[PDB]
Amino acid sequence: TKLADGKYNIAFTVWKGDKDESSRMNRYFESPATLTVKNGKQYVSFKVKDSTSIKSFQVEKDGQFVETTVLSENKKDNTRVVEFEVADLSKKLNGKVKINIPIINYNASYDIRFVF
Ligand SMILES: [Cl-]
């Protein structure tokens, strides 16, 4: 059941945090993600669109949301690559996104789930 070391692509979709429905956050998170399996551990990374608007992206780690790691940024196309470890790919991962639209007092939070 445990994946061999190496790099893979893994498709994913985003559900709403509290409903079994597709989340609007799908448009910002590019599937497939990259899965890096190294020394048993599993690291997921993927590109985020409209990066400047996605002020915060956290995933739940030990019953608490923690900011994801930024591996790189591309200011030209307004994207960035985020990364986090996932212990169990068969489970839905809880996440939180803070969306900021400066063109107007607009600052809202989205609860989401990653489905691999
Ligand atoms: Cl469920």
Residue numbers in the entry: 31 to 146
Reproduce passages from the article.
B. anthracis, a Gram-positive pathogen that is a potential weapon for bioterrorism, secretes two hemophores (IsdX1 and IsdX2), that acquire heme from hemoglobin and promote bacterial growth in low-iron environments. The NEAT domain of IsdX1 is the only known NEAT domain to bind both heme and hemoglobin, as well as acquire heme from hemoglobin, thus making IsdX1 a useful model protein to study the relationship of these processes to one another. The structure consists of an immunoglobulin-like fold with eight β-strands arranged in two antiparallel β-sheets of a β-sandwich. The heme-binding pocket is enclosed primarily by a 310-helix (residues Arg-54 to Tyr-58) on one side of the heme and a long β-hairpin (β7–β8) on the other.
To gain an appreciation of the residues in IsdX1 necessary for the hemophore activity of this protein, we solved the crystal structure of apo-IsdX1 to 1.8 Å resolution. Overall, the backbone structure of IsdX1 is similar to the solved structures of NEAT domains from S. aureus, albeit with a unique surface charge distribution close to the heme binding pocket. The backbone of the 310-helix in IsdX1 is fairly well-ordered even in the absence of heme. The integrity of the 310-helix without heme could be due to the hydrogen bonding network between Ser-52, Ser-53, Arg-54 and Asn-56 and Met-55 from the helix making van der Waals contacts with residues in β4, β7, and β8. The structures of apo-IsdX1 and holo-IsdX1 are highly similar with RMSD of 0.51 Å. However, superimposition of both apo and holo structures highlight subtle residue sidechain conformational differences surrounding the heme binding site. Additionally, there is observable electron density for two side chain conformations for Met-55 within the apo structure, where one conformation is pointing toward the center of the heme binding pocket and the other away into the interior of IsdX1. In contrast, there is no conformational change observed for either Ser-52 or Ser-53 between the holo and apo structures. The apo-IsdX1 structure also has a similar protein interface near the vicinity of the heme-binding sites of adjacent monomers; however due to the lack of heme, there are more protein interactions between loop regions surrounding the active site.
